[PDB]
Design a protein around this ligand. Structure first.
Ligand SMILES: [Zn+2]
Ligand SMILES: [Zn+2]
Lengths: 953, 4, 953
């Protein structure tokens, strides 16, 4: 009947809790499509995933498919303006990104639901007639180069490429996927390559309809979405391109039984054990690799990790299957190493093989399979509603792997018990097939090879035949046992009726010396889950660096101690987060409500009766010292943000101060600290989800009673509930703080234009200005001027105060970056003067949509309320109130705000800049004043006033 | 031409 | 704060390139105001637009609002002297006019910038206390009558009123807006109506401050302009008049599906298709009517026009939205018709409905809307600076439709794509809603109706149901496609730095046998535009009537051939003019410099390689024959001017000579002609704008190289570069040539008092005398004596010679008109003798200001230079030199000049009069000699000497 549609799928299986409607189809040209109708959505979304990626780059142009991914955003025949796409999205509350992996290039956006067709039309042209403009190409190659640079000193990226470089060099797996200025411009120029032509040729050859999948989500009916996708995508040409396949494993015989010794950037110690395996993707209905990963990676009693930790050799372990490409996969067992563990790598690996042998001895267990199946079924049924942008992008990828009807369920529902496949995979996990990599600063000076793209220093050796033989002879170790039945699996999914007195926002249902309890029974999502958030206030968590260290160590030790018990709950969809803060402690328990009070009670009890194991203490102390030292290897822009935080906040201990005080933390001292920390507390909580008022009051009082019983906790005084203030900068002031990053050879800058205390009017002046300049800042400072890959602008909010911030990471010196940001601000003032009234209203509407966008899941709603609570503003109806005010603003209002607070000659300009120098280190910019250079943070803060704190709503 |  | 001011407008959004300053306000009485401060302007200006016009005329006094518009100029209580306003303006380098439309009456002036307050005060009185003097009314009604007459035999006005006459007779749309002596005097007198009373009643009821908008542009600051406007306009009374609205369409069901067959005056063949549509004005942010007009009216490949032209049925097409009034509009598709097209009207209309069906099939196209939006943005940004008088008038009209802040942007910038509104309008363009009018001499003697005001002969018939049904079933025609992306859109807006060797005036930078090249780099406007002007001299363009015909036909065919390609360039702000001249060919390329070389090269290439289509040849030849014949229907004063040109120029072929020779132009002869024409040329060029000396030389070389390559062009000899002379009249001679206009029942006259060759002194004697008599001539011969609506005096310049001319069109016989002009000259002599030194110096200063008035845009400056070049006087500093000389002239000098050259008894009087009789045809005038009556123009010229040619500066 319809020539443009090859087939329409049968019913797309979905959760009975999922109210979105679905239709799958395949266009005549071979594009697989999922349409998603959600008449409730505030943002609509589309994604397209092409089944081609960096494994297919020309061997003489590394990075081409990734470079092409960048270039597709920079103009098409129908929409030739370089930022037409980005500008359109920004002006309609939208956003976009993309990525390139070895076999996929995935593009996605969201946008206001009223402007889906406009966004999708501009998007579709990417796949029809990109311009690959010569000038755009010359500029954007710099962004890719800066992307690569950012990764160069990153340990994870270095290991990622090292693995590729130590397999078969003839295999496409060995390719460098990012590319850089050298591979994408310098070398091609030397070799007479016309890169524009190569981009065109690659697009023409591989961007074929037959290798594409598209997903569109909007308020429109499935019929209207259908007509829309046919209309825009049926014109993509089918070149009938064979799907690339890689049946030959990158790791052949000569790449097995090998040991690599590797020097990291950070002071880290890790062991990576890898086995090549066949591609298991086609076995998704049984998932033999996940079965084995579940067991080998278990953290409960009897597990591999439990014994390795008890021996004091490792702290964490990750195990299971790892994607490769079509035709090959890996199975891994990776662990971190204590100091002793580093000396016992051969033994650690022997235990790995002993655990594997236990699996072989017991044989495949149907009951384990059944647990995994049951948990996946529950996870699928009660899955949180996803944000459209991530949902479309994800589905577009998986449409390539599953029948239309199964795309939603394929990754969840298990159907087949396959002991034959389990055995088959287990038979690959043998010493004769192993690769071993050790990462440690101890190899410094002892290496003889260098990886070309990152400079990674390493040594390769054959593993001795005697070592292999010992591993092959691994016997059963009595410490290893299969997990027992998971008692945390939930079975009560009853949704409690909405109470007569239920409220739309959290209500304060308890207000006592000890505790403040905000409660809301879920009235939106109706899944059997709840979030229980607690802030524990105590002066002794942050009184000095020593105590801040002890608060940290106490909670790390506590989590380490509960891990074995809590791991079963985590598998069963019940998790917790526990951490020290500048005001005390933060605890959040989330997931299925059924067994939640059991886990919560256990945590609080353990907190209040904690007994420290001395060996765990020393190990965790050493790891924490390294974590503090390792900050030196974070990126320049992360440094800049950190320094700004220290500068602008009333109290803040530096990493240097923490690590100095760490040597003074002894076991007796930590033992004394805990009862003192818990002796006086105030608890402010948000309990939100599938729970009644009475259950909420009972959970709160259970927590209190537990601390009272075991820690003799008494209430803090109201005056001790002190929040920290932000430093108040002087009118017309400019301060600069300058540091150097010793690891990275890029600079970082953060510029902060402090405005005033948060309030309805001040919030919306700043947010509207930020909205207006958001896309132009990126377009100007990155796309045109190419200062770096990382270019950010937006509101900065802290301690009730706010202002406008810019963050850039660049090869250029910070003083140069400063001048270009100042040039840009003048550009924006003229831009606002020149923009039409309607363009101004569009920005108001875009901000409005962004602010009113409804949470799709419980934790998103909880996060908003929690923000009101921890800031102590308690403005639960903020979005309505602030958007109402926003809509009354005029161009004149914003120009005046800029002239008063932001302009270079503004009477109330309050500017502080953090300059982070690299390791070794156009519109007209205005002349700037001489800055006051900050020499000492403490003296800086002492010599300035402190803002007031914002008053509660 | 458009009128106009 | 200031009580006379209700609100002051926020920032008025303007073009980034616009240095003028703006302030909007609303006065307490409701007048909307825009103030424009331009400290560089040589003339200041004001306009006031009242939102009432002829749709509000009393049903029994057709023309009242128009008549009122005339009367406001003829005296106020403060300034009762009948011509005080006009005389003041003339004495201060100013000018004024006004017009009356259906809903607006718009009055405007300019004046020397030093005299803004004086003119503005006189102007303001129009809106406060007009005299409507009884004697002025009885005279000025004749001007309105004469204005109407002039229009009676004009096909456009006839059609304009016929449309009104064929809609609902009860709707105000049906009204006759001009009025005439019958409707404004005779009928009122017989009905006992007091017209002065009615004028006052109309002014009182409708000239209300709430329906007024005023714009004032001057050198003054915005604050001073603010005070000036408040001072002069806050006293205008607010009657709080409701704004007329016309929500019912003048075309109701009984007016649809109607066909009109109309006999024109000229031999023209046209088809007018009209659909009634809702008022689209409120949709201006999306402008769906402009979107549909852009497409339906498109002239590029795939267009409706292209196919109609290929079928050989039409040559030109206008399509799109047409204004009605508040509440109603129209959508039109109008074409001319070939002889075959007249026989195929039903088919042409079918094709119109097929193209519309194609638009419906494809649905609205966002990329089209975006391209329009972006071109509009570019146009707005780089908009030429407007002349004050037109700018104030235009803005005063639009202040009624847009908020103050949006008045500059409102008619350029498009904002939102509204496909729903496009579909709504497209849904109106259906056969059941159509009106069809065919204009053709073939209906002579076949009509049965007469329109009352013009006498238009026509017939009306219902369109048969069978015909409507066939149009309703219009299907897709493979010939029609949407436009392709416009590839002429400019992208390079770089303004090149002014060169070290840049000159203030054009410099001669190439001077060879083949080409003379004048060049100037713009040093005033700094917009990314240029003007490229070329004169190609060849003796074969005008050697005889046949060659003149061939030169015309060649260029018409060339333009016709290039039209599809050049239309896109047009839309993208890049245009060209190409025409045959008496000396060869003229080519001008104007607009954005970016892609100019590409269009220019295409034109020259096409010129030199031109291949003629025989069918286009015959069609264009037939149109040209009618065009020559149709001159018989031009106005008597246009005839007079034409005959004087023929009489006074050495060589000039008459329309009769041209058409006699036209039958003889055959395709083979035209083909032979072109290479002959191009074989030898001299090219004189002016390249002025955003271009460097080097690019200028490169452009010229490309032009030369292209003709040399394809046409084998070689240079002319210098002796061949002849220019034509003016006939030298004998001292004391008076010649009269008499002809009759067979169409109009008015006479026309031109009287020419030849003085002498142009020179600094002779030029300024003549221009100062003209300045002095200018306003008095109009006041005397029109306002007092009411000889006609058209009364003009001023310098005549031709072929290096000059003199004083008068042109009048009148119901009176030309011999009467002669005596009245002669009577006026004597009055002026006495007036000049009596005038004070003060008055005399005012006239010198007024002329000075007019001559030194600075060009506001590139093309105004180019035109000045171009005048110096084609006249071969090359006096680029003329204005400074001639004004310096002007300032030394005395009253006695002027009197002597008059006595020697112009007076009736002048020794060197040289008079030639052209008398054009109508179809059916107080101060003391002096006795006149008997004229020599010219019987034959050739004989006349043979019997007189010819002047020399002026020498180059
Ligand atoms: Zn990238
Ligand atoms: Zn008039």
């Amino acid at each position: 009947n319809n020539p443009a549609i090859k087939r329409i799928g049968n019913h797309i299986t979905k959760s009975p809790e999922d109210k979105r409607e679905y239709r799958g189809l395949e266009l005549a040209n071979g594009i697989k499509v999922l349409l998603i109708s959600d008449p409730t959505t505030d943002k609509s979304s589309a994604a397209l995933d092409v089944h081609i990626g960096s494994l297919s780059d020309p061997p003489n142009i590394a990075g081409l498919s990734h470079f092409l991914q960048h270039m597709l955003f920079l103009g098409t025949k129908k929409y030739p303006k370089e930022n037409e796409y980005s500008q359109f999205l920004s002006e309609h509350a939208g956003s976009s990104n993309a990525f390139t992996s070895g076999e996929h290039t995935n593009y996605y956006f969201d946008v206001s639901h009223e402007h889906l067709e406009g966004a999708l039309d501009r998007f579709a042209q990417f796949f029809l007639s990109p311009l690959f403009d010569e000038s755009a190409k010359d500029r954007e190659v710099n962004a890719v180069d800066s992307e690569h640079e950012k990764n160069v000193m990153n340990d994870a990226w270095r290991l990622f490429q090292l693995e590729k470089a130590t397999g078969n060099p003839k295999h496409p797996f060995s390719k460098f996927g990012t590319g850089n200025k050298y591979t994408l411009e310098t070398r091609p120029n030397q070799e007479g390559i016309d890169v524009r032509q190569e981009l065109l040729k690659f697009h023409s050859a591989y961007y074929s309809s037959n290798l594409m999948a598209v997903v569109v989500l909007g308020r429109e009916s499935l019929d209207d979405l259908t007509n829309l996708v046919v209309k825009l995508f049926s014109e993509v040409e089918n070149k009938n391109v064979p799907l690339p396949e890689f049946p030959e494993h990158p790791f052949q015989e000569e790449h097995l039984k090998q040991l690599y010794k590797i020097v990291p950037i950070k002071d880290i110690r890790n062991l990576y054990v890898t086995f090549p395996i066949p591609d298991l993707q086609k076995y998704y209905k049984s998932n033999p690799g996940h079965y084995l990963g579940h067991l080998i990676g278990h953290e409960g009693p009897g597990s591999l990790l439990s014994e390795l930790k008890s021996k004091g050799w490792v702290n964490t372990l990750v195990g299971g299957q790892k994607a490769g490409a079509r035709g090959f996969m890996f199975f891994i067992i990776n662990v971190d190493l204590t100091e002793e563990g580093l000396l016992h790598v051969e033994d650690i690996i022997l235990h790995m093989f002993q655990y594997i042998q236990k699996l072989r001895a017991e044989g495949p267990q149907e009951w384990v399979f059944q647990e995994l199946k049951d948990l996946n079924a529950v996870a699928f049924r009660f899955k949180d509603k996803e944000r459209p942008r991530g949902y479309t992008s994800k589905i577009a990828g998986i449409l390539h792997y599953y029948p239309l009807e199964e795309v939603l369920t394929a990754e969840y529902l298990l159907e087949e018990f396959r002991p034959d496949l389990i055995e088959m995979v287990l038979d690959k996990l043998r010493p004769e097939n192993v690769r071993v990599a050790i990462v440690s600063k101890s190899f410094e000076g002892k290496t003889d090879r260098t990886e070309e793209w990152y400079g990674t220093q390493y040594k390769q050796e054959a593993i001795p035949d005697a070592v292999i033989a010992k591993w092959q002879n691994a016997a059963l170790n009595g410490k290893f046992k299969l997990p027992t039945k998971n008692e945390f699996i939930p079975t009560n999914f009853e949704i409690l009726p909405l109470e007569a007195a239920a409220t739309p926002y959290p209500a304060l249902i308890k207000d006592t010396a000890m505790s403040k309890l905000w409660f809301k029974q879920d009235d939106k999502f109706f899944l059997p889950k709840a979030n229980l958030n607690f802030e524990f206030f105590s002066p002794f968590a942050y009184v000095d660096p020593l105590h801040s260290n002890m608060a940290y160590l106490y909670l790390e030790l506590l989590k380490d101690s509960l891990n074995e018990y809590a791991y079963a709950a985590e598998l069963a969809g019940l998790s917790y987060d526990l951490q020290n803060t500048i005001y005390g402690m933060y605890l959040s328990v989330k997931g299925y409500n059924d067994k939640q009070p059991i886990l919560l009670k256990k945590i609080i009890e353990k907190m209040a009766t904690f007994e420290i194991d001395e060996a765990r203490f020393e190990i965790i102390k050493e790891a924490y010292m390294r974590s503090l030292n390792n900050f030196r290897a974070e990126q320049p822009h992360q440094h800049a943000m950190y320094y700004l935080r220290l500068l602008m906040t009333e109290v803040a201990w530096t990493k240097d101060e923490l690590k100095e005080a760490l040597a003074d933390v002894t076991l007796p001292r930590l033992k004394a600290f805990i009862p003192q920390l818990l002796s006086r507390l105030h608890i402010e909580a948000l309990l939100h989800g599938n729970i009644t008022k009475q259950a909420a009051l009972g959970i709160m009082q259970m927590v209190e009673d537990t601390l009272i019983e075991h820690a003799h906790t008494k209430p803090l005084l109201p005056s001790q509930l002190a929040a920290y203030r932000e430093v108040q900068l002087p009118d017309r002031g400019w301060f600069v703080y300058q540091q150097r990053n010793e690891v990275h050879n890029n600079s970082g800058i953060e510029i902060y234009y402090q405005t005033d205390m948060q309030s309805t009017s001040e919030n919306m002046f700043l947010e509207l200005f930020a909205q207006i300049i958001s896309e132009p800042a990126f377009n100007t400072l990155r796309t045109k001027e190419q200062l770096g890959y990382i270019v950010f602008s937006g509101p900065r909010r802290a301690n009730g105060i706010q202002g406008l911030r810019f963050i850039i990471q660049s090869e250029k010196p910070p003083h140069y970056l400063e001048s270009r940001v100042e040039a840009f601000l003048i550009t924006m003032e003229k831009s606002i003067e020149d923009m039409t009234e309607e363009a101004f209203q569009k920005h108001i509407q875009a901000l409005a949509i962004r602010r009113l966008d409804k949470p799709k899941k419980l934790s998103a709603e909880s996060a908003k309320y929690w923000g009101e609570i921890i800031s102590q503003q308690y403005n639960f109806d903020r979005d309505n109130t602030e958007v109402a005010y926003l809509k009354t603003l005029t161009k004149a209002d914003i120009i005046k705000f800029y002239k008063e607070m932001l302009a270079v000659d503004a009477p109330r300009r309050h500017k502080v800049s953090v300059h982070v120098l690299a390791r070794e280190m156009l519109s007209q910019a205005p002349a700037l004043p001489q800055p006051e250079v900050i020499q000492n943070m403490t003296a800086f803060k002492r010599g300035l006033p402190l803002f007031p704190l914002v008053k509660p709503h | 031409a458009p009128p106009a």
